[PDB]
């Protein structure tokens, strides 16, 4: 074998402790750059003029933040969707003021995480597996694309991308509610059904398999020792599990087929989260939640408030207060 | 910044006490007969 042939054999080797592969050739450097920049920025970055109004917001630990308040702050509204790599700045000091780290991080991250998804297909192929784990990962990935790329595109600025920080995330959520009434949007509602249901079914499946473990141990040892890695025989009794759950509800509401059950476990959260991602990605173009403001009117024409109108009052509070020095004109159009 | 002056010891013991409990248990497991 020549050098290229050998290199290819190593890259695609099924024997590396962590699989590299061709997607990994892009994933490794991009994820390392994003990680390193993030860590350094989160600790040490100076304040960033997120809203382009010369009002710098401090995100880093050394500049007065704790783990909860800290963030890498989105790039300046003055930049908008302009590409702002380090070399476009006159200095690192300028780059930092304008939120250059945010762009470097999210672009390397999105590239790296897309390659992470490809890499999941890639290894499944090398191991002779079925290929669709990567399709499940497309759900959180799509969600990351929605908040870091698609929303900024629709609104015309990376300053409206989700901040890389715990409190910045909450800021993004509250402002999103004000501007899109996301709670009243059916795609976010499907998302909630996806994650509440995902958690429910996770607990359900956990509890049912755990409930029907076949006795292989004594009381002075963990029942976990009753299963040995790679054993051929199933470790629980699915017939007893189905016997239980089918009586809890009724026979035909319970799965007796493990393949069907596990498919449902994959599908429910993944589809819901795809809708969550699509909610963000379509509210990115301002097709917003249901608006029933003043929908109910009496015989004279008096407005009779519903809970929708109370939501509206909360939303107004968010709207009027957010970015309190950034608006000069009466309508918030992006 | 005007932080709570007990936050440091609170955090350090919060980590150390249970971590130490686990390390003690782990190491004495390892030293048991194979």
């Amino acid at each position: 074998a020549n050098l290229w042939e050998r290199f290819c054999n190593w890259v695609t080797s099924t024997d590396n402790r962590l699989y590299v592969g061709w997607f990994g050739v892009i994933m490794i450097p991009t994820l390392l750059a994003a990680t390193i920049c993030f860590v350094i920025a989160f600790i040490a970055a100076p304040p960033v003029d997120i809203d382009g109004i010369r009002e710098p917001v401090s995100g880093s630990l050394l500049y007065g933040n704790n783990i909860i308040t800290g963030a890498v702050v989105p790039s300046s509204n003055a930049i908008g969707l302009h590409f702002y790599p380090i070399w476009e700045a006159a200095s690192l000091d300028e780059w930092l003021y304008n939120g250059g780290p945010y762009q470097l991080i999210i672009f390397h991250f999105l590239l790296g995480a897309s390659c992470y998804m490809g890499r999941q297909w890639e290894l499944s192929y090398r191991l002779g597996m079925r290929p669709w784990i990567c399709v499940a990962y497309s759900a959180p990935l799509a969600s990351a694309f929605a908040v870091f790329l698609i929303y900024p595109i629709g609104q015309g600025s990376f300053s409206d991308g989700m901040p890389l920080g715990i409190s910045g995330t909450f800021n993004f959520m509250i402002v999103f509610q004000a501007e899109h009434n996301i709670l009243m949007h059916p795609f976010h509602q499907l998302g909630v059904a996806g994650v509440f249901g995902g958690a429910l079914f996770c607990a359900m499946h956990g509890s049912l398999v755990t409930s029907s473990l076949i006795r292989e141990t004594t009381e002075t040892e963990s029942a976990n020792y009753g299963y040995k890695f790679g054993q051929e025989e199933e470790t629980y009794n699915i017939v007893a599990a189905h016997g239980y759950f089918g009586r809890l509800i009724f026979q035909y509401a319970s799965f007796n087929n493990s393949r069907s059950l596990h498919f449902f476990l994959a599908a429910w959260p993944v589809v819901g989260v795809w809708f969550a991602a699509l909610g963000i990605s379509t509210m990115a173009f301002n097709l917003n939640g249901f608006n029933f403001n003043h929908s109910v009117i009496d015989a004279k024409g008096n407005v009779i408030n519903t809970w929708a109108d109370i939501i509206n009052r909360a939303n107004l509070g968010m709207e009027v207060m957010h970015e309190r020095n950034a608006h000069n004109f009466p309508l918030d159009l992006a | 910044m005007e932080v709570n002056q007990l936050g440091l010891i609170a955090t350090a013991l919060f980590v150390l006490v249970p971590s130490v409990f686990l390390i003690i248990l782990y190491v004495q497991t390892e030293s048991q007969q194979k």
Partner: protein
């Protein structure tokens, strides 16, 4: 002749027009004629900030700084009356234009110095008996420097002058006295000074260019802290016209 599409994103839009080396002529002033500056442009090239004296109370120096707000610094499309005075001196009375830019510069070690770089209400005069504007003409005068933030500006805790809370609402039972300087917003208005040094004159077109140096105070954060002294240096361009 350059179009917007030729200029966009190059940096040229933040530059003042230049005159070539052959422009060393003289522009005659007819003292019976009225005049205007149709366009005054000021392109800063250096911002210097006076270091705060350690306490030695010697001469504190103006030191270099790094611009962090990009190519957003120039004053332009400024216009005003150019009066001919009885002693033959000329007085420029600034009327209007893009006559201010917020600018943030950064000192060694990280301290950021925002300022309202401006010539608002500039009144600048030459030496007496200026029968022609030549490469020996200079303009000297003063301008107004209003508060860097205007009266609606709200601080991160929602406090302001014409709007906002008037107290530190997150500390409902703190003693107010220690917080008065942060709670009570004040609107600054001070004077700046500028010299315009003509280096080039096109006698035929009425165009002049040269160098300037201005001195003014930086942002005081609506009275929360002391402003710094700033010296701005750069190039200028003006088109003189009969009007």
């Amino acid at each position: 002749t350059l179009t917007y599409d030729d200029i966009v994103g190059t940096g040229l839009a933040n530059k003042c027009p230049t005159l070539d080396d052959t422009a060393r002529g003289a522009y005659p002033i007819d003292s019976s004629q009225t005049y205007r500056i149709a366009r005054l442009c000021l392109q800063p090239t250096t911002f210097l900030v006076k270091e705060e004296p350690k306490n030695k109370r010697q001469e504190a120096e103006f030191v270099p700084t790094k611009l962090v707000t990009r190519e957003t610094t120039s004053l332009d499309q400024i216009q005003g009356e150019l009066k001919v005075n009885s002693d033959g001196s000329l007085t420029f009375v600034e009327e209007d234009g893009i006559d201010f830019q917020p600018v943030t510069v950064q000192m060694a070690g990280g301290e950021r110095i925002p300022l309202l770089f401006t010539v608002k209400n500039l009144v600048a005069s030459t030496q007496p008996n200026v029968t022609s504007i030549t490469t020996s003409t200079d303009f000297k005068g003063e301008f107004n420097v209003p508060s860097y933030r205007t009266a609606n500006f709200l601080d991160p805790k929602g406090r302001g002058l014409a709007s906002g809370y008037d107290s530190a609402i997150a500390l409902p039972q703190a003693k107010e006295e220690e917080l008065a300087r942060a709670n009570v917003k004040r609107f600054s208005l001070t004077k700046g000074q500028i010299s315009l040094n003509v280096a080039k004159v096109d006698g035929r077109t009425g165009e002049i260019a040269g160098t300037f140096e201005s001195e003014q105070l930086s942002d005081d954060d609506m009275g929360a802290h002391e402003p710094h002294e700033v010296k701005i240096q750069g190039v200028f361009y003006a088109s003189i016209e009969p009007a």
